[PDB]
Design a protein around this ligand. Structure first.
Ligand code: HEM
Lengths: 498, 498, 498, 498
């Protein structure tokens, strides 16, 4: 390359001389302090690792395209969803509880984090493989995730801790049912569905509002593993899902999902018999049918997993005109939490990394900070200014809001006509599952309760009977026989657990 | 507790009001920005995770005691090793390559990181479960560990990458042989040996020097798993070793190790037929027999894994009077690398956390920094000073050094009479292993090579024949039949690997 | 100390050998990499500095006591303010705009950050030396502080930037008037008043609410410097105020302030003719007289400025039972902003440092994180739990809240009968100032406008005439003559400014 | 810009709606948690500040060009210094002790940090405005800089602390003399000289070595301020030097310096009568005359001070082929210290920021880490590899080294024939200074000693008499009369100092 090149450089671009031997006083002498290549390479090595995500540490993803094939402009003005629009995407899939090195095939929720690189900013639909969640207020989320992780003394996951939390938070029943059913163990990420879970707001060009749910239905179908199959794979190939996705795309097999929405008129949000602002509820498709939007295709692997996947930073706060948040307390907490975490995990300038940069021009009032790659030159740092550096100042009601009235309180959401903690779980068990899925569900839940401390087991029997009397008694009977499946990723009992 | 108590507090000690519901405008309204308990708890949640160690992320440990039962005062003045001395200890065990959530029973080196809380400072013997390592110069260490981790695009571990590195760094053969043998898969941490690996310096009260090796021989014996058993356990119980140690201690079964040293007179370090400063070499016990020192017992579990184990920060730089480093280049690099990493991983004041604090008084010229818990009051910040705040100023040759002479160079260490890359590996295969261990070794190495890119396989056949002609041909034959064990933690081949 | 002691230790407690010479190969040879004392001391030196506060970087403080001498229990149940109560305090004083090394005697607001170490938590009254501020919505605060700091290209403070911001944000007029008056240059921190500025909520034992203002009236009186005196001191003694406070306390002269409150009945908050929730307004003492509470005395210097002052972390979120926030948007933003900044500035565990620790027991649901000094042992990490580890779950309206009703909006606060941007500023100029203070005010404002770009000057003449026609014309006349005082800390004009 | 644009964006590129009002429940209601623009802008504001440099916090700079106008190829092969070569440069000037906001015109050393963006990497000559320094071993540097900063309790600079350190470290006398002379107060950065201070190694194309000193002689001459003038300016314009440089360049007045070297043959380094490896010594120009190299011109201001100046990261480790370090212990410590500090101050990827990026291609074995902007794709992470990703492996003696022989020691450097602590200082006072400069020097040193604790004063009288008997007695006489200049930036005495 250069006249004095050696095959590699230091960080300043000068030849490095050797990537294989340190600088010593003769062959037998000590290493000198001024081996600057040894220092730079080791100091960087020592700073490669970054905090893993909490939750959703273990995951991978791919790039692709979304194509709108229907007309939903009467519901939203968002550029990404206008007729015919094609938009580049990034999708990261993940588990929830396990850490960076944990097996892909533990029983768990899966993440479905989808970025659209739109012409009006990065739009992130940060979803999961379920339409609901375990909780309806974000104050509980910290407790839930800690209960899914490790005991403070022994450092082991513990089903007693998990069930102690779930049984004492009965709002969890709908999603625990989903988790313990077939879909707790996707065969591949290509063979699971994605969902927004929350109600979001869509706003059309005239300002009319609808409450919407997102459903990404896999064109590869929904295919799952048994507990025993998933345990075997966890030992044989801890990266089975990561490998599957990369190999599939490398061979030219590009997985697809069709996006559908449900759309509730603004005024009906307040009156519907299930609370659309309660993340533990689904909305009936008889009442609000699915409406097709378009198709997502994944077609391109990362070239650098760490820079393009590990360093990606998704957030529900990354809305675009035509799409807003909703009165769902969980979503409102998420609006804060992701960006906050990313400032620590990645850095203040996380959104300047290529994968997080929008396609359109950023004109944002933020300056300085560590690792400021793309600076603002001599632009004004304040507003209004007399130097022609524009700012925003729209006054009055926003286009993507709603109304509220009351005293400051900490209390449960008011119940709609058909709201409770157990009924939708019961519909899932009784009406949605097949007989074989119910049989497997009993083996799963009974196994998940094996070795759990008996006080917690007794509460779990009541919890499951509240879901469904028959399933609850079947579970109790099997637990009392000390039978049930091993659950990949967690157990109970012994001197190192509760 | 207090007149207005609610059951828990915020970070300022005031009652928190609720750990279960956020502060909203009426039951149905949005969360307010000034829910300071929601903010504090989520912002802390978002900062719980710290960078995992690189390497040795996955591990656990226990506290105990070392008791000296022999007299080695003619070799060292170190307080911890004087006759009859009992000293509190902490031992962290670990794998090497896998991340925080990876299975305990992957094939790998194990760490054996032992702190002695001595009356003259914390003395750390940061060992492994092998007396040797893969490399003899720290410039190569970064490359080696990266080769043991993941491919840059797909994020998969890859045996092709591992073997490409090993075959191109034939100094690795002694330790690769040990790793691929029985001891690559300890049954429990209680049933493996520990070693310092490096030569260290011991200095007696009169200033005489000896070069020493440390050997911690388990009183529970050395017991290992087959590849197939370890794979099965990796799926069924990713924390098998962590659980075993905690349960053992909880039941009152306290594991023990007997410490022995080898002691080489100072002048013989330069002349010995194997280089004692080459980390790829063992020293013959016929030439330098083992000398008993005393016994290590583990007897107490952590009460908080994260604060006492994850936040522990060991370093070979933590020598005490009577114990020094040596001309081993690897050890000299380690003297820098651990403390450096810990400043990033934990923080500038890592050594003020309780687990890292010495028992004796610290009087160190370091002030200020983030998270400064134990400040120095009005003590002088400079030396010499006229205010009675003491300092050190010993001049001339140190008590724990050695000589050097030469020009600044980057080159391999000079060979002693019997030094090479393959001979000690060959003794291990031919003379130490049993017939059954050799049979299993062939199945292990052949399995480890299954699916590896053929150029790299061909280099590996030559590497193994250089270790031993017979074993190398047996391995080659089996690889050419496409037979061999699955290796827990890594594979080769397919569209997502080299 | 120890048998092998040398006068100081390394971080592990072992003797350091020398604080004065590095470890070299002979007297003439290179420094070796394994000079671990050189490495530890330099790596700590390189991590001593922490981000300075933004704003309020330049400051110092002292400890003391608050004594309640009146009965205000009909207004608040807070333990700190019950009859006869004595509470330890910490007070940090500061400027606003200048950085860590800037002169104490620049013209500026001064901070008055007061912690009470109460028996129900740390209560922080984070005040200033003025009862008002420049702004009424926190979205503008970032812009304001940046406008008070440096131009993006040249790195100079610039009065053109300052006035461009102020004139385009006429809500600033009340506080700009106060700043440009006598009190912009306190002689000492002992000779200025402190104020909460915001309306806070006080809640009594029966739950009745009052809106309150805090006033700390110096027993040393209010004494100020001229611009010329303060400029001279800025050159001669950049730490004049820091030195004054430390010397005063060292000699036994303990400064005092008497605390008074104004108390507005809950329902009158909504109806009062000035908006008590607008930080740009004072509340008439004819309408709501001052009510004495007690006396603050400072009596003890820090022993370590960095650990006790620089590392102190105050926050308006640190309320205690009996004291809450208010509908003032600025205060609601502050509830978030301080703790957030401190996580970056100091660390996640900022509130475990001794100066930030409460006196009462903390029982908070936060675990792990870097630099975790005081761990929670095996306490449950989730709620509810079946292990006897308590939590909070009060449901329904909080005791320290209020009501709201409307659509989500971004707009100015509604005007009360007597609200505007200029009238209270005009009362200050016309009715409060003396003739000599008005003369000096003209010289100050005219000087502050010298060299300012003419478009901005023209807007400033209109701004000042809106405050008071007479003062505005006097200022304009003097600016058009190119006369006025030099203002310590800032100027305008030349090729490096707007 | 976009169909729904508002004048500015959030960090994701979506319209921000307002930079001036927060999102509230009606005009009178609270701010909602999901005001994501308020959150992003405040969280960034709270992370703008970065640790200031230690030392050399206060500074500024400009870009320019170096032009070689002579032929020094017989001494170096470095591309930047070959005949006729023109290279872009960046120069940052600074004080040493004061913090980010301190006045530019305090008495102090000035930095002269010069980067050349060469075709073989960034070459940094990190100099000062003096050819010598206070110390000859880096172990003392931490102590020295702390002694130049603030007392641990009161937070004041203290001349007693400064002189306690200097008098107890008599190696300081040469540079203290220079500092206390005329050049302690440059009028502008344009009117001071720059120096490398250390001996560096130059290596020619044939491998022959010379020891070199760098001298940058200002074409604007050397012009200084009196103590009284500099004190006055410190109050009136704390940024006088920063402003001067920016204004000069903005008007088209481009300051210049001529670079000269001294060149000592390799073998004469060992024998010269002053130790060229002792940073407290100059080398006689009668013995080794200055040899012209070329001319530096500054011609371009930053467009963004923070990104281009504050975030610049210079290091003596940034050598290029043809230029190496030397046996000077101070320089060898600097090889480690700068890069280390920058990892904390700026970040692991500091050298990827535009100002720190080389012009030539970087091919460095470092991957991952926070804020990784320019990733390496699928490049191999290890060496040797079988994938065509090059590395370095030069073996044997380096081209830019030297010899050493001895035992590991901590001791002073051996004295050459003419080495001592006081003689060169004495030549400066007696032979270099004029009568008026000597008169001013007495007033400066006597002023610097005013109020210093008497034990330290007595040691200072002996120190100055050792420099020169006459000057020392003149200083003592004046100190005993309680006369001398005020010294800008520091004083002694009173209850807040020693
Ligand atoms: C062993 C002694 C020394 C050590 C350990 C040392 C260390 C440091 C460190 C850590 C910094 C801050 C770097 C950063 O954060 O970017 C610094 C800055 C600086 N030092 Fe040194 N220093 C020493 C001696 C010297 C000498 C002798 C000179 C000149 C010949 C010098 C000139 C400078 C300059 C000019 C800067 C500021 C660079 C800039 O403008 O960014 N230092 N020093």
């Amino acid at each position: 390359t250069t006249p004095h090149a050696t095959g590699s450089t230091r960080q300043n671009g000068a030849p490095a001389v050797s990537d294989r031997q340190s600088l010593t006083v003769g062959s037998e002498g000590p290493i000198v302090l001024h081996d600057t290549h040894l220092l730079e390479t080791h100091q960087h090595f020592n700073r490669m690792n970054i905090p893993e995500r909490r939750p959703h540490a273990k995951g991978s993803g791919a790039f692709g395209e979304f194509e709108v094939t229907e007309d939903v402009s009467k519901y939203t003005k968002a550029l990404v969803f206008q007729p015919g629009t094609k938009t580049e995407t990034l999708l990261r899939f993940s588990t929830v509880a396990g850490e960076l090195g944990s097996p892909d095939t533990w029983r768990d929720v899966r993440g479905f984090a989808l970025r659209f690189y739109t012409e009006e900013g990065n739009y992130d639909l940060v979803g999961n493989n379920t339409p609901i969640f375990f909780l309806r207020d974000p104050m509980k989320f910290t407790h839930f995730i800690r209960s899914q992780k490790r005991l403070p003394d022994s450092g082991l996951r513990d089903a007693t801790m998990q069930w102690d939390f779930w049984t004492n938070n009965p709002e969890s029943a709908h999603q625990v049912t989903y988790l313990m059913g077939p879909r707790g163990l996707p065969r591949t990420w290509r063979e699971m569905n994605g969902y927004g879970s929350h109600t979001y707001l869509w706003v059309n060009a005239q300002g009319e509002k609808h409450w919407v749910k997102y459903h990404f239905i896999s064109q590869q179908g929904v295919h799952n593993l048994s507990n025993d199959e998933a345990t075997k794979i966890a030992g044989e190939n801890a990266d089975f899902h990561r490998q599957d996705l990369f190999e599939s795309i490398a061979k030219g097999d590009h997985p697809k999902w069709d996006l559908y929405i449900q759309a509730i008129p603004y005024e009906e949000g307040k009156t519907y018999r299930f609370n659309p602002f309660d993340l533990t509820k689904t909305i009936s498709q008889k009442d609000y049918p699915r409406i097709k939007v378009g198709t997502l295709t994944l077609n391109r692997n990362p070239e650098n997993h760490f820079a393009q996947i590990e360093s990606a930073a998704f957030s529900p706060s990354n809305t675009v005109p035509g799409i807003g948040l909703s009165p769902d307390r969980m979503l409102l907490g998420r609006a804060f939490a992701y960006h906050d975490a990313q400032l620590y995990r990645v850095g203040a300038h996380v959104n300047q990394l290529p994968v997080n940069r929008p396609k359109n021009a950023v004109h944002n009032y933020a300056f300085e900070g560590q690792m400021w790659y793309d600076h603002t030159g001599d632009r004004s740092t304040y507003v209004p200014n007399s130097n022609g550096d524009s700012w925003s100042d729209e006054t009055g009601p926003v286009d993507d809001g709603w109304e509220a009235d009351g005293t400051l309180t900490r209390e449960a959401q008011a119940l709609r006509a058909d709201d409770d903690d157990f009924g939708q779980a019961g519909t899932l068990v009784r009406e949605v599952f097949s007989d074989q899925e119910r049989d497997d569900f009993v083996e799963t839940v009974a196994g998940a309760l094996k070795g759990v401390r008996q006080d917690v087991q007794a509460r779990a029997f009541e919890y499951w009977k509240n879901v469904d009397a028959t399933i609850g008694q079947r579970i109790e009977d099997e637990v009392k026989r000390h039978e049930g499946d091993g659950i990949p990723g967690v157990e109970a009992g012994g001197e190192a657990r509760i």
